[PDB]
């Protein structure tokens, strides 16, 4: 590889955005760590950017100008800093100096370079380290293509409910299944709160897959919301492709719990609450809830009472929501609920009002009026 012909020219803002995206899954330990690096490949007039956390494998492509093909492994954080450092150039020229294990970066100006021009030198890994990192983008058992906008909404309603500990293997995954009508269905839970999203997609094949939630948190940052996204499953892997991206990860090989059994059939007590006012009041009563997150709710016909109380000190805040912001049909019911779960759940709702229904001493069910595709359940806390 020679300096004069081992380079590429790219749009600075574009490669900045793609590096920011790719490094999203990279835990940036130390500049000498190959797992803190990303792999860029020049292939004719395309640049391929790859990153991995050794479970999720990510690949993006952008158009460039080049003369020879080559690969470079470079610390993601430093490379991002370099491109940010040069964001005042519309285009940059990136030169690979294999003799010194360095990327030399200069603005790709439109005409002559002077003696003294701005210049960056970014050290790279050796060519022998690329073999340790590289991944090449299996027999698919089932695939669907859906609108990006819909998939983003489903992710927004599903991802937050999965268990947050990646070592609690099953509950940290998003469960893909099929309902009685053969419609694709997503479920997530941490054991205490749960999201269920039924789609309109009909799938003839068997669907029984558990996908670690991290890829969905990643995806919601990547998807524009315009266009289509192809999703594919194999025996061991999950695959997603859309726009200039390809992403894959491993499935969790386990048995997802029988979520169907905890869905309440008919609930005796039903409330309809104005969403914006609920959000505002929860933010205020939150100032009176301790680290246990225990919020005490009282449902009556005329009002919903929100009580934040500290039993040790006597510090207490009480807020009421009444007509025209609250309707209730049921018995007088007092219950404790995790305010973080409550707030997190209602923050994904987009309707003017929210339905909150429950059987006494049982799971609280949250839903949108006229939406029969989305259900969120929250187990109450012991009142005492």
């Amino acid at each position: 590889h020679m300096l004069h012909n081992t380079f590429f020219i790219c749009e600075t803002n574009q490669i900045m955005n793609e590096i920011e995206k790719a490094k999203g899954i990279i835990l940036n330990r130390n500049m000498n760590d190959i797992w803190s690096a990303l792999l860029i490949e020049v292939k004719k007039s395309n640049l391929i950017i790859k990153s991995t956390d050794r479970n999720i494998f990510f690949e993006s492509t952008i158009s460039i100008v080049s003369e020879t093909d080559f690969k470079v492994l470079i610390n993601a954080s430093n490379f991002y800093d370099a491109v940010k450092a040069f964001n005042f150039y519309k285009k940059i020229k990136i030169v690979f100096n294999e003799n010194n294990s360095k990327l030399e970066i200069m603005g790709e100006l439109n005409d002559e370079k002077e003696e003294y021009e701005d210049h960056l030198k970014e050290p790279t890994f050796s060519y022998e380290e690329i073999e340790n990192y590289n991944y090449d983008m299996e027999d698919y058992t089932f695939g669907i293509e859906i609108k990006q906008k819909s998939f983003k909404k489903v992710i927004n309603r599903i991802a937050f409910s999965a268990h947050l500990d990646e070592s609690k293997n099953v509950l940290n995954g998003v469960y893909f299944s099929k309902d009685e009508d053969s419609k694709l269905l997503l479920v997530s839970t941490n054991g205490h709160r749960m999201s269920i999203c039924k789609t309109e997609v009909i799938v003839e094949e068997d669907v029984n897959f558990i996908v670690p939630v991290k890829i969905f948190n990643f995806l919601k940052h990547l998807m524009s919301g315009e266009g289509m996204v192809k999703i594919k499953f194999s025996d061991k892997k999950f695959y997603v492709e859309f726009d200039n991206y390809k992403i894959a990860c491993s499935l969790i090989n386990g048995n997802y719990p029988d979520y169907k059994s905890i869905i309440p059939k008919e609930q005796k007590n039903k409330s309809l609450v104005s969403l914006g006012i609920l959000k505002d009041r929860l933010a205020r009563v939150n100032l009176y809830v301790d680290k246990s997150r225990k919020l005490v709710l009282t449902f009556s016909e005329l009002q919903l009472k929100l009580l934040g109380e500290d039993l040790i000190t006597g510090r207490k805040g009480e807020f009421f929501i009444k007509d025209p912001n609250y309707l209730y049909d049921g018995a007088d019911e007092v219950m404790a609920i995790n305010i973080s779960y409550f707030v997190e759940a209602i923050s994904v709702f987009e309707t003017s009002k929210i339905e909150i229904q429950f059987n006494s001493g049982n799971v609280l069910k949250l839903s949108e009026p006229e939406n029969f595709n989305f259900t969120h359940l929250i187990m109450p806390m012991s009142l005492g």
Binding site: G191, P257, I262
Partner: peptide, 10 residues
């Protein structure tokens, strides 16, 4: 802090 009626799990 009881869990959901999940089998198994709670």
């Amino acid at each position: 802090v009881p869990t959901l009626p999940l089998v198994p799990x709670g």
